[PDB]
Design a protein around this nucleic acid. Structure first.
Lengths: 213, 171, 154, 227
RNA sequence: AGGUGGUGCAUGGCUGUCGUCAGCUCGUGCCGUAAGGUGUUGGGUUAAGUCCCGCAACGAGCGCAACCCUCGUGUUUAGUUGC
RNA sequence: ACACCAACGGCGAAAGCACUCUGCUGGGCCGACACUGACACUGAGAGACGAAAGCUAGGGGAGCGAAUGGGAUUAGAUACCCCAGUAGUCCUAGCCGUAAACGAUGGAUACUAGGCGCUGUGCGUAUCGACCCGUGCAGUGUUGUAGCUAACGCGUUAAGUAUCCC
RNA sequence: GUUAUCCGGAAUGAUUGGGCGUAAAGCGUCUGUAGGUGGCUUUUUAAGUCCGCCGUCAAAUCCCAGGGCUCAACCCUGGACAG
């Protein structure tokens, strides 16, 4: 139907993530390496913080290869929640990430950064409405709660679409709320979006968050 | 766009609100058949201060509060002289809903149909009895009571209007 | 508070509206000339037609009407008439369709007069009014600026 | 005191009323006579209601408010502006929008944009952009110049609105009746005294009768500011 | 564990279509008891609800267009493996 | 059977009524006090009239035209189209008594804004004569205040306010 | 608890209390008998109407106030508006 914004704006105002420049067979193998790194980080923090309390919200995992050394930046909003306090979080990340890249034993620097305002970053906010919506809370309370929760934290325009099988139904719906300008067509406009799938008990839900900044 | 509307909602101790019906009213379009919510909100303090208001919006709560903002610009005050009851009996129709209101003894809680009883239990009157003659409707019913309690006069202003000095009143 | 103030205002006015109801007591070229509505000069008749007389008046188009012309007791002429004559005309309706001006002699106009109390005080304040009128009329310059700092209405 | 002699109105276009088979008969206990296809207004009750008018205008400004005057007719267009620059009041230039009093939230935001565009018009950065942006700013600034040019100095609602006679501005009048704002206006020979709650019935065919009652109320307001 | 077993009428994601058609709505106000209308209708003009005037409407969001790529012309700069 | 005249026109209680003229005869409207002095309104049952089609009896029969007959269209056509065409249409004397017989609004009286009209008469102006202006009424129409109405609308000819009678 | 019967709700037979342009409903219109209602002033009788008094409408029931059964149900004593 409609093209998605992070695909559409790639020439200008949106940059790629897996930022390493290579040759075809080495392109396929570098894409192997990228996918296993994002797997180990996602599954890692999901396990070692599933035992912990709250949601983490890792938005971007940028992977860069200057020399035979791999800079990995992790853009989560709540980075104090991760570490085992001396630095041992990112150290054990570096262990399990070293577990699946040592073809050529090249060094890698896993860093971690802060999101400027974590409510304004659609992967994190989509994780929040995912978490509250995965708990038994209605679409309206949680979704308006995400809206005023966002507009207290300085966002120009917003669109929230939540897909089928809301609280008790056997007929799917779509429910979208918009505030302000969200021009999806304006190429300069810099809209960042996320598309998170909530795996509930009585079905699957789909959340798709557009944020115009 | 300051946020959370904490000061701006005006916490509504002054006016207490209730719906009296929320019917989903629907229109059909080329694409299909889509509905909005018409809610009827009766606002009013128990001091003697009420008024109806309709609203409709695709959300339920925005229709309720939208009908409330329509309602809290539409207020009459209730002429209620005695120990929280009525000066005299009254009847006044609106559209095709006729409403007979009748004052009561103080040992009588308000007895009326749901719309009339809703706008009187919000009006702070305690001792009335109002039969409804006519429609099954709720909006024209309640608005017919509002017209049926605007046109109602105390003894002091009828004594002021006629010019008669004062008698014929127990209190 | 603002709503209450408004209500109080409305009460004041309704009482002010309660005290004293009781007691008390050819044409195309003329159309081309009318590019602009402004400027009276001595009314020029440039067409004549029963219903009235059509009259260029300093750049503005006017309409005199028969009932608003001088009564004619003289032997000969067509009533309404006017051909090219130049007549002192007072500013009346100012017709809204096409933005004209109407003109009216208005008659003898004798009206019955009822005596009004306080004319002793009532002449004095009429005099004061005339003095204010003489102080009024100011042809040139525009007030404004007064400097200040502009602020949001919110 | 605020008197007007009976002869100053009786000479001019005050009893010089309107058409004799167009009268709206709620003036039937009011209108004095009829002559030559033109009505004749009773001048006693006219001047008394003007006495009441200046009592209730000068008292209302003696409380301390801001008044409003509507100007739209193009027969009395600039005379209101002359009757509003000296009198400090904010005024309608030529034409009215339905909603300038009751829907005043959007009118208020429209004054945010009009205030910002006057700030850009004064600042001298108008000649930066080419004829497109300058054309658009001149067009919207021309339309807001048509309406909001004469009421820049108002926030909120007035107390008394005095309007161009009856015909063109039933819109603004009905917004005043919805808001409850008391209005004291002019009545023709064929209109309602019960629209407003006090008004001044005199014909407005004469420009000098309009200048008479308006000039009278202008000195009423300015002496209201005299404090 | 595995299931390319069933149900696309339990779903998500993705997509086609009407159709790149020019619309679809909302806030506030007004009208109607109300469903609703009004805006968005009318006079012109556009590929366009594009823009202008009048109008109880005033504004705004998504739509259209532009910003995006490519092919068009020229200038500055760099000349290899290209001239 | 009666073109133009024909009009959102006149009359009748309704149905109806238009080529003109004559005869008999109904009804309406207006004025003067000229007279009587409440004789008024409605009306069960009753009685009369009552478009068109229908029927009895006798005339008459050009046009039109159910039924019918033929041709066409059509899969088919008992129908629309076309060509013939009988009862009927008209008149005399009756019977029948129904119609969207509609203003889809029983009748009567009293009272409650106006604008624009038409018809009939009456007064005054103007001339001295046709006009022409206002009006007094009655009737007919069109927009419309108040009020009523579920709404559309009706609104001095109410679907308003009241009273009476079926 | 279900069923049946009756009243309510029901202004859904309407005096209190409905309707008849279009929702069910104004006869096709008109004359008129019986009958119904009816202008104003003055006077008379009082049939209706109103006021007083008197008689009666059994007792029991219902209403008020007492009293009795441990209370109540029930029983008993006295009183009376209506009409």
């Amino acid at each position: 139907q409609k093209i998605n914004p992070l695909g559409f704006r790639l020439g200008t105002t949106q940059s790629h993530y897996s930022l390493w420049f290579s040759q075809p067979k080495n392109y396929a193998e570098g894409l192997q390496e990228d996918q296993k790194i994002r797997d180990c980080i996602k599954n890692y923090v999901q396990k070692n913080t599933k035992t912990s309390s709250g949601v983490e919200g890792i938005a971007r995992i940028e992977i860069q290869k200057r020399i035979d050394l791999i800079q990995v930046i992790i853009h989560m909003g709540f980075p104090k929640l991760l570490i085992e306090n001396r630095p041992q979080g990112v150290e054990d990340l570096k262990i399990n990430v070293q577990k699946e890249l040592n073809c050529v034993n090249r060094k890698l620097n896993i860093a971690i950064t802060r999101i400027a305002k974590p409510y304004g970053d659609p992967n994190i906010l989509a994780e929040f409405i995912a978490g509250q919506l995965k708990s038994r809370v209605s679409f309206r309370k949680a979704m308006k709660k995400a809206i005023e929760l966002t507009e207290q934290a300085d966002t120009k325009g917003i669109q929230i679409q939540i897909a089928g099988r809301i609280d008790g139904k056997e007929i799917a719906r779509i429910e979208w709320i918009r505030e302000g300008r969200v021009p999806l067509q304006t190429i300069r406009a810099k809209i960042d979006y996320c598309a998170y799938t909530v795996r509930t008990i009585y079905g699957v839900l789909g959340i798709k968050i557009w944020i115009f900044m | 766009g300051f946020g959370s509307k904490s000061k701006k909602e005006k916490i509504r101790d002054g006016f207490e609100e209730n719906v009296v019906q929320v019917r989903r009213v629907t229109k059909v379009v080329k694409g299909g058949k889509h509905m909005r919510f018409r809610a009827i909100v009766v606002v009013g303090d128990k001091k003697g201060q009420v008024g109806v208001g309709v609203g409709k919006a695709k959300e339920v709560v925005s229709a309720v509060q939208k009908a409330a903002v329509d309602a809290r610009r539409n207020i009459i005050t209730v002429p209620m002289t005695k120990y929280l009851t009525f000066p005299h009996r009254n009847e006044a129709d609106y559209g095709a809903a006729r409403v007979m209101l009748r004052p009561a003894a103080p040992g009588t809680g308000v007895i009326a149909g749901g719309a009339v009883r809703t706008v009187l239990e919000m009006a702070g009157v305690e001792n009335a009895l109002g039969k409804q003659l006519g429609s099954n409707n709720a909006l024209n019913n309640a608005r017919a009571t509002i017209v049926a309690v605007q046109t109602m006069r105390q003894f002091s202003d009828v004594a002021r209007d006629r010019g008669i000095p004062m008698e014929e009143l127990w209190k | 508070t603002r709503e209450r103030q408004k209500l109080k205002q409305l009460f004041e006015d309704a009482y002010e509206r309660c005290r004293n109801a009781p007691m008390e007591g050819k044409a195309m070229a003329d159309s081309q000339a009318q590019l602009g509505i402004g400027s009276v000069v001595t009314g020029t008749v440039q067409s004549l037609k029963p219903y009235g007389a059509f009259i260029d008046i300093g750049g503005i188009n006017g309409l005199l009407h028969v009932s608003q012309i001088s009564h004619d007791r003289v032997s000969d002429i067509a009533t309404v008439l006017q051909p090219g004559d130049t007549l002192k005309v007072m500013i009346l309706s100012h017709d809204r369709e096409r933005g004209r001006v109407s003109l009216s002699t208005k008659k003898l106009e004798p009206t019955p007069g009822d005596m009004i109390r306080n004319p002793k005080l009532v002449f004095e304040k009429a005099e004061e009014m005339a003095q204010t009128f003489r102080q009024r009329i100011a042809q040139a310059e525009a007030m404004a600026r007064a400097d200040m700092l502009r602020f949001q209405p919110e | 005191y605020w008197n007007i002699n009976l002869e100053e109105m009786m000479e001019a276009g005050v009893h010089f009323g309107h058409g004799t088979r167009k009268w709206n008969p709620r003036m039937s206990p009011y209108i004095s006579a009829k002559c030559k296809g033109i009505h004749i207004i009773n001048l006693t009750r006219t001047a008394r209601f003007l006495s009441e008018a200046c009592d209730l205008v000068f008292d209302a400004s003696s409380r301390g408010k801001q008044f409003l005057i509507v100007g739209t007719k193009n027969k009395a267009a600039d005379s209101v502006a002359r009757a509003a620059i000296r009198a400090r009041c904010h005024y309608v230039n030529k034409k009215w929008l339905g909603g300038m009093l009751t829907n005043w939230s959007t009118t208020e935001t429209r004054l945010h944009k009009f205030r910002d565009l006057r700030m850009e018009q004064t600042a001298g950065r108008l000649a930066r952009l080419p004829k497109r942006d300058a054309a658009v700013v001149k067009r919207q600034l021309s339309h807001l110049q048509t309406y909001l040019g004469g009421i820049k100095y108002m926030t909120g609602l007035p107390d008394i609105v005095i309007i161009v006679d009856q015909q063109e501005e039933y819109t603004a009048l009905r917004e005043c009746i919805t808001l409850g704002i008391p209005t004291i206006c002019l009545i023709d020979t064929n209109c309602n005294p019960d629209l407003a709650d006090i008004s001044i019935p005199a014909n407005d065919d004469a420009i000098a009768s309009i200048r008479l009652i308006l000039t009278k109320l202008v000195f009423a307001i300015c002496e209201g500011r005299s404090s």
